Amino acid sequence: AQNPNCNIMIFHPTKEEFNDFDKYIAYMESQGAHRAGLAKIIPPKEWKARETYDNISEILIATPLQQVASGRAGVFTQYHKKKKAMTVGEYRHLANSKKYQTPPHQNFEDLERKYWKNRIYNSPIYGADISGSLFDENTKQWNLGHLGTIQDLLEKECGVVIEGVNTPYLYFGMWKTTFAWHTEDMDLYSINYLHLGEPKTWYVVPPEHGQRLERLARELFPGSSRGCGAFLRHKVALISPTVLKENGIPFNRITQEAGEFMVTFPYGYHAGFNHGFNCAEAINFATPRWIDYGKMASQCSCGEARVTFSMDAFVRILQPERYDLWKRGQD
Ligand SMILES: O=C(O)CNC(=O)C(=O)O
Ligand SMILES: [Mg+2]
Ligand code: NI
Ligand SMILES: [Zn+2]
């Protein structure tokens, strides 16, 4: 078996290798990349997502989210308080203010220590889930707006045509902005490009050990767990690396910088935080290997997780038994 310790692998494709997305994903998995739940992809030195980022300030963040924490330093939930719309220009100015800016620090390690020590005493503001793309339409390789769709993958694999479309989202982050422990909708893959600014640190549990994370989570968030059999889909729960180590949960960590891609793999639980002002673009995708994970994916039926129009059809085809009760959580 390739990558038996489930380490995060880093790839350096040539411009020749960078022409065929599907085939490069298949290559990475032949080297065991998926076992980690997360891989880093450094694009060829010749490749650019777009010419410059000089004209992005007028993008609107219609619903900025203030991330308010409750709990203890290493075990907390966050809720999202809706704030008034601002442009990316205004947001960037906010992220750089004395109140929200990244603090003085030695290295990613000193910064990580400060994040986990101090996160809960602050409420950073995230621009999340904004429909759009910053890839130049002339960028032909690894353009997240031009990937093959999940609906076409399902159709090629299973012979059934379904409704739905699949488009990218932009995330604008600042210091301490946080992504809670989760897998993707329907345990899909994701791909994430950090377009500009400060880094993003990621924690990930190998897919083969995901259930151990879930079991710890049921113990750490006992009331959430009683309310919903898949409460991690609410994307509110945080657990520090110290707490994970204390409980024997296998995981890994890696820091993404501007200009790099990350791929998350089916059923790879991940979480993280932003080091300062940045902009990332992400989208879900599928391969033939995803189909079985889609069929087994846990669902939120308490009605908190509330998920896309396109997800309906996945549940309808892949999980016809769940499909009655699930859309009751959606309606
Ligand atoms: O970048 C973020 O804040 C969240 N993105 C993801 O969880 C992802 O790409 O899978
Ligand atoms: Mg603009
Ligand atoms: Ni994700
Ligand atoms: Zn739920």
Swiss-Prot record:
It is found in: Nucleus. Residues 136-302 form the JmjC domain. Residues 8-50 form the JmjN domain. It catalyses: N(6),N(6),N(6)-trimethyl-L-lysyl(9)-[histone H3] + 2 2-oxoglutarate + 2 O2 = N(6)-methyl-L-lysyl(9)-[histone H3] + 2 formaldehyde + 2 succinate + 2 CO2. Ubiquitinated via 'Lys-63'-linked ubiquitin chains. Deubiquitinated by USP14 with the help of TRIM14 leading to stabilization. The modification PolyADP-ribosyl glutamic acid is found at E16, E17. GO terms for molecular function: chromatin DNA binding; damaged DNA binding; histone demethylase activity; histone H3K9 demethylase activity; histone H3K9me2/H3K9me3 demethylase activity; metal ion binding. 2-oxoglutarate binds at Y126, N192, K200, K235. Belongs to the JHDM3 histone demethylase family. Histone demethylase that specifically demethylates 'Lys-9' of histone H3, thereby playing a central role in histone code. Does not demethylate histone H3 'Lys-4', H3 'Lys-27', H3 'Lys-36' nor H4 'Lys-20'. Demethylates both di- and trimethylated H3 'Lys-9' residue, while it has no activity on monomethylated residues. Demethylation of Lys residue generates formaldehyde and succinate. This is Lysine-specific demethylase 4D. It comes from Homo sapiens (Human). The chain holds residues 11 to 341 of 523 of the full protein.
